[PDB]
Write a protein that binds this ligand. Structure first.
Ligand SMILES: OC[C@H]1O[C@H](O[C@H]2[C@H](O)[C@@H](O)[C@@H](O[C@H]3[C@H](O)[C@@H](O)[C@@H](O[C@H]4[C@H](O)[C@@H](O)[C@@H](O)O[C@@H]4CO)O[C@@H]3CO)O[C@@H]2CO)[C@H](O)[C@@H](O)[C@@H]1O
Ligand SMILES: OC[C@H]1O[C@H](O[C@H]2[C@H](O)[C@@H](O)[C@@H](O[C@H]3[C@H](O)[C@@H](O)[C@@H](O)O[C@@H]3CO)O[C@@H]2CO)[C@H](O)[C@@H](O)[C@@H]1O
Length: 209
């Protein structure tokens, strides 16, 4: 299942989430997984994880191995398909009012030129991003500066609504329909291939350098 934890740090700018159940440590050995500064939310840090929903887990927020940790709290994840938590004085599953759902999708363009488009449909009316309110081929998207051959598109919504999109070059090359499941306020996906050969990754693939 897709886990997301946001923490308004009270332990400094270097923090991690340690998760455990019966000696299972899905976020890694102590101190766990480092939480990255949350985009668009000063003071917050965020980590994502895939874990086995066969069980609940315990969470220990800490300063990433530098001697300080908060008291354990239970993540009642058993049987759930997804879960996003906010920790700001206490554990919450309620999105803060000012937060949006920001979905980032990376596409690896190979031998289809340097002008790439993203066509999008099915999102909430509040949606903003390259392809909103645009008929085929959609909106043109820029290249990822740090990753060669990749292009990025970001769709922001006020509500947690799934949608679909297609990457293309407006010249006969396009992906399969990409069905985007929004599982958190900072959902990230990686896409490769074209029609018949489109693959969607929920964690960065080896192709992501
Ligand atoms: O899952 C089965 C076990 O569950 C329980 O163990 C838990 C602990 O209760 C938690 O506290 C935690 O342990 C952490 C610990 O909190 C953390 O500080 C770190 O411990 C280091 C410590 O920093 C360092 O100073 C030195 O003392 O070594 C310690 C190593 O023990 O890391 C610990 C985890 O590796 O999580 C565990 C589960 O992983 C329960 O208490 C057990 O009885 C049970 O078997
Ligand atoms: O929601 C209504 C509509 O949704 C689906 O249609 C989508 C297509 O499945 C999808 O491929 C895409 O179509 C584009 C073509 O791929 C592209 O080649 C070019 O011709 O532009 C098309 C978009 O105008 O998007 C549409 C939705 O706009 C679903 O399959 C339909 O059954 C359904 O009617």
């Amino acid at each position: 299942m897709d886990l997301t934890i946001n923490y308004k740090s009270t332990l400094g700018d270097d923090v991690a989430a340690y998760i455990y159940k019966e000696t299972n440590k899905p976020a890694g050995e102590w101190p766990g997984k480092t939480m990255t500064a949350t985009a668009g939310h000063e003071g917050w840090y965020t980590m994502h994880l895939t874990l086995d929903n066969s069980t609940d887990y315990s969470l220990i927020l800490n300063d990433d191995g530098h001697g300080n940790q908060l008291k354990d709290v239970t993540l009642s994840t058993k049987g759930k398909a997804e879960a996003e938590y906010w920790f700001d004085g206490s554990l919450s599953e309620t999105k803060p009012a000012d937060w949006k759902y920001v979905t980032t999708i990376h596409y690896l363009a190979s031998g289809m030129g340097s002008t790439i488009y993203n066509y999008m449909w099915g999102a909430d009316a509040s949606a903003t991003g390259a392809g909103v309110g645009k008929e085929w081929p959609g909106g043109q998207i820029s290249a990822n500066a740090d990753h060669l051959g990749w292009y990025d598109v970001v769709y922001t919504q006020d509500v947690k609504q799934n949608f679909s999109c297609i990457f293309n070059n407006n010249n006969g090359t396009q992906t399969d329909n990409i069905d985007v499941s929004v599982t958190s306020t900072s959902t990230e996906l990686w896409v490769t291939g074209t029609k018949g050969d489109t693959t969607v990754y929920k964690t960065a693939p080896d192709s992501w350098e």
